[PDB]
């Protein structure tokens, strides 16, 4: 059972030390957040880091704080005012309305617009009320209760007049009639120039960052005659028996580039339900398949995942991974 | 007139690019906040950094986000729950109740306690209503209106039952009868062991981080026969004609150490109204003097500064710096 201490000055770090002293042997996680980095801050952060179970130094940019911990001189007031950006518009992910609410309030006249957080935006309200998520005290119900509370805040606090979504024609959690819904594709079909799939077929497995998925991935590659793996940005193990694509791009960027260079090629994307399937749903010459290993429980994924994939016309291919 | 974009994923960075594309030549400040650092995040941050006027990558710790931008698997839900700290107590600076309100709400059952932000805590409510701060549209009135709004939030939202102050016997802005006020000194007199000032006198000027203060500082040192300067943690210029103390400690730490080693020495601290004067007000064998250069306007400092210094028994020494 931990105590947290949040500090943004050296003296607050000393105070934090005094508090720790009065609670000897208890567990403390100390956070320092400052815009200034200099010898003294590091010296004092190191000091409190030796005394706490866990400490972190969040580094911020110069000018972030509109507020003052000290009593400013008139000059310091002038400097601060004539430095602050004059902000006309803030764009942020719908759920960042919750996590950065405090900052939005310091710019009450800015026009706010939101964009998809990601595939989280595709779970409808009524789905959070589903029986899956309605057992009191369970992990799934805590998730749903947390989402419902946050969407409510994102939708009704700090008014925003527009939401950009990257998912054409799936109902968005943000579409509540209090804002314009605007489709914002990741590409322009005009610049891509894809034509008829008269050329060949390229098969790619989307790698998983979970290492327990290694054998299952390797078995999928064989079972389905898949030439390539595109590793996940956080994937840290290698897959054998398949050609790994070493590219600097995430899959959507990689595939859009390859389509432009190969406008007649058929790309087949196979995945263990990555959100990239929903993100690439409407890319030309792209055909997504979901893979379902028999050895995983039917409820490995939440029910809305199957429903979005199915609504989106994405086949689910089951296979006995043994 | 700037636009801000806040992002916490790679794809949100692409979206941010699309938005920028639709607003060609306008000014954009882009912020990326993530717990994950890997090749792909840096590649994509660099990319958007080449496209925006200003961009920053705030690095956060692993686990910070209780929320999800994607639809989690059951396994990912389990991992997240069994990782989150069980928090019993949060200590934070009174004004951090405002800036980190969003985080407090994710731990609604934690006991919250606050401590001084700093000398800002010593300006009373009625003082913000002073005539100095009551001219509509001025920089001082915007400051007061901002403080009044934030203290109100800090005092009445997310209930906290106790405030630690480091300033004995000056009225605190947080003392509103909705919390215990607790004095928390920076030292124990029991461990310091200061005795009668039978030894010698040490005179120290507190350096200023403002370089326009250089000549004035150097003239003060001569006029007042001050042996030493203790530079401010952000001071970046050197003072001539005085011995600069090269120490790793801030003044309060330095002086407490020197007192313990020299319990009969008289320390005289001279300052251009540093908050360290108020912080060290009640240190044994310490005698603080405020310095007021004739060449600065009478309103260089705000009126509550003079009043706190005067209430605290701190002489103000005027001198014609020429
Ligand atoms: C905080 C957190 O966990 N974030 C995770 C990310 O670290 C990863 F863990 C995961 O990834 P997941 O659904 O599969 O896919 C998310 C994005 O990762 C890229 N990708 C994925 C697989 C692959 N083989 N090649 C790729 O290039 C695509 O751009 C895709 O749209 C997850 O659920 O495992 O979910 C994402 C976020 O949803 C995403 O990073 C931003 O939209
Ligand atoms: C964000 C921001 O501007 N922060 C500023 C700091 O960078 C500096 F700019 C200033 O400093 P100021 O009142 O003089 O004093 C603040 C603290 O700095 C240390 N000190 C100061 C002068 C000196 N010669 N030797 C020292 O060791 C002491 O610990 C003192 O209590 C300012 O008003 O100029 O105010 C502080 C904060 O109030 C302080 O850092 C935390 O309490």
Curated annotation (Swiss-Prot), chains A, B:
Changing residue 210 to N: Loss of catalytic activity. GO terms for biological process: lipopolysaccharide biosynthetic process. Keywords: Cell outer membrane, Glycosyltransferase, Lipopolysaccharide biosynthesis, Membrane, Transferase. Changing residue 232 to A: Decreases the rate of sialic acid transfer. It is a peripheral membrane protein. GO terms for cellular component: cell outer membrane. CMP-N-acetyl-beta-neuraminate binds at residues 207, 230-234, 251-252, 274-275. Optimum pH is 6.0. It is found in: Cell outer membrane. The active site is at residues 210, 232. Belongs to the glycosyltransferase 52 family. Present in outer membrane vesicle formulations which are used as vaccines in human. Homodimer. This is N-acetyllactosaminide alpha-2,3-sialyltransferase. It comes from Neisseria meningitidis serogroup B (strain ATCC BAA-335 / MC58). The gene is lst.
